[PDB]
Structure 1
Amino acid sequence: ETLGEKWKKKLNQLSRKEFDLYKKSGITEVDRTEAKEGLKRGETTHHAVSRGSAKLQWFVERNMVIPEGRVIDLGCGRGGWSYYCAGLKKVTEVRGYTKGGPGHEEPVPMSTYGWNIVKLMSGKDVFYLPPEKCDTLLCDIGESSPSPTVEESRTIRVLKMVEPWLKNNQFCIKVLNPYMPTVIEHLERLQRKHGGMLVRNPLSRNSTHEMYWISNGTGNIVSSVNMVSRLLLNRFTMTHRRPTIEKDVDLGAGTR
């Protein structure tokens, strides 16, 4: 039994009250007040449609992924990763696909900087999409479940699905459950072939062990996974630490 599995078991024991306090304890979060108010008013400029724009920006501004040319955004949701990439100098085209429909977010149309180079498509299950040529491959798919074996199956499926899209390009792929031994085996094989490294984003909630496989980096996958498991385990030991608050991103306005 891995450290991650011990973390999961403890998470599933928490009451809703304990869970809600644990999930943001000591994390970093952007202040969404202004964006939520603007989006409720139907404002289409400046606001990021979700917390996702700030989350991908954290990797981008650390050069862990450097979006360029044709960007494919798998599981785009409302479009936060897509609208963020739309304003980056090196990006020329953004194609987002998302499931939508009941239980899934629909793309939100925006007029933030570079909106005219974005195409978001709903009603698209990426597990049936044939791969397309692209310069940047992003994937943020991985639905949490109280069952780690269900999460293991979901994580492996994402990893098998993204590989044919990987052709010496920039990438940032969510790994929902990176601690299960079978997932580790796939991550190690994929890293030997495609390089990159698994990174924990400080904007992720403690209620998920998610890590991101990013193209520009090296390191030991097992060590990075066990470091996260120990961090999350130590976060149950103390009383709620209020999250570190940062400014949300301003995605501006205008065509390009």
Structure 2
Amino acid sequence: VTLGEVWKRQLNMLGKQEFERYKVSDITEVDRTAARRYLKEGRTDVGISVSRGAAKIRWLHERGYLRITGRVLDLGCGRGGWSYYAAAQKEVMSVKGYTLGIEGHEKPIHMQTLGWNIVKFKDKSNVFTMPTEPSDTLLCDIGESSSNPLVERDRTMKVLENFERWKHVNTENFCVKVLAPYHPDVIEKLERLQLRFGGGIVRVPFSRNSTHEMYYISGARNNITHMVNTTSRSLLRRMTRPSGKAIIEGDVFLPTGTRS
């Protein structure tokens, strides 16, 4: 029915090699070699990011989609890539990161990058069961992929309901992952949230062609439906004519040390 529904069906039909070629086609990508090399040797002192995910929040911040300010809540922080990026920013006073930590390599990793001493992590935290707390900047990077679009729809709606709960009057800045934005129920929900909170939706170019994820952000106003369909059309175009090639750029590097 929607363009994004056509995209998901066709994606699931792709052959193994077609899939691998398509997923990286014309996407942007950070080179993670330096970070991985330093992490393998346990070098927590060096100015590197713990995850690939940090490239998404840098693009959001640097391109004017998101201000990062005051007390920041990082929901679904995982390793801490968004938390440590935030801690390094001028206007930030503290970061609190919450994550399930269901798997070992998805638990917070301590670093000594700038402002590490103003970050607190709590793993074994379900942000859906816990009471909300005030924030000036609310981040949420939750949404597990599924080949089943109905599963992805439910996951997305669950994340958006909890976001509305966590989103306080209080909260000026926000960035929330919308796993599968193309579902009519998801669009209708985002539209009512936009009436309440403002903002708009953006597609981060570091996302792989194999997911339709977009981000609901405070920093811009735009038409939800127009933005989602434009992404759907881009992803379909890339499928019929796949370059099989990502544009590689430099990773997220950080200053190091404590902040007062």
TM-score per shorter chain, which class? over 0.9
**With structure 1 as the length reference, what TM-score do the two structures score?**
0.97
For residues 252 and 104 of structure 1, what CA distance do their matches in structure 2 show? 24
Letter in 1 for 2:15: S
2:38 alignment counterpart: 38
Question: Does the CA contact (< 8 Å) of 2:176 and 2:215 recur in 1?
Answer: yes
- What is the Cα deviation at residue 241 of structure 1? 3.5
- What is the Cα deviation at residue 173 of structure 1? 0.3
Letter in 2 for 1:133: P
Letter in 1 for 2:70: G
1:9 alignment counterpart: 9
Paired residue secondary structure (1:124): coil
CA-atom RMSD, angstroms? 1.1
1:86 alignment counterpart: 87
Is 2:109 the partner of 1:108?
yes
Q: Are the structure 2 counterparts of residues 236 and 142 from structure 1 closer, same or farther at C-alpha, using a change threshold of 3 Å?
A: same
- What is the Cα deviation at residue 238 of structure 1? 1.5
For residues 207 and 239 of structure 1, what CA distance do their matches in structure 2 show? 12
Letter in 2 for 1:95: K
Letter in 1 for 2:218: S
For residues 104 and 195 of structure 2, what CA distance do their matches in structure 1 show? 36
1:74 alignment counterpart: 75
Letter in 2 for 1:190: L
2:199 alignment counterpart: 196
Paired residue secondary structure (2:235): helix
Q: Are the structure 2 counterparts of residues 115 and 184 from structure 1 closer, same or farther at C-alpha, using a change threshold of 3 Å?
A: same
* 1:188-236 C-alpha deviation (Å, 9 max, x unpaired): 0000100000000011100100000000111110000000000000011
Structure 2 residues not aligned, in runs of 5+: none
Q: Which deviates more, 212-221 or 95-104?
A: 95-104
Identity %: 56
**With structure 2 as the length reference, what TM-score do the two structures score?**
0.96
For residues 102 and 10 of structure 2, what CA distance do their matches in structure 1 show? 33
Q: Hey, which bits of structure 1, 4+ residues long, moved more than 4 A?
A: none
Letter in 2 for 1:24: V
Q: Are the structure 2 counterparts of residues 12 and 187 from structure 1 closer, same or farther at C-alpha, using a change threshold of 3 Å?
A: same
2:136 alignment counterpart: 135
Question: Does the CA contact (< 8 Å) of 2:139 and 2:176 recur in 1?
Answer: yes
For residues 40 and 18 of structure 1, what CA distance do their matches in structure 2 show? 32
Structure 1 residues not aligned, in runs of 5+: none
Pairwise mapping of residues 41-52 of structure 1 onto structure 2 (< 5 A)? 41-44=41-44, 45-52=46-53
Letter in 1 for 2:78: G
Q: Which deviates more, 225-234 or 93-102?
A: 93-102
For residues 246 and 196 of structure 2, what CA distance do their matches in structure 1 show? 37
* 1:28-51 C-alpha deviation (Å, 9 max, x unpaired): 001111011111111112110001
Question: Does the CA contact (< 8 Å) of 2:79 and 2:105 recur in 1?
Answer: no
* 1:97-156 C-alpha deviation (Å, 9 max, x unpaired): 000123771111111111001111111111111110011000000001001110000000
* 1:164-188 C-alpha deviation (Å, 9 max, x unpaired): 2222420000000000001111000
For residues 252 and 242 of structure 2, what CA distance do their matches in structure 1 show? 30
For residues 120 and 18 of structure 2, what CA distance do their matches in structure 1 show? 40
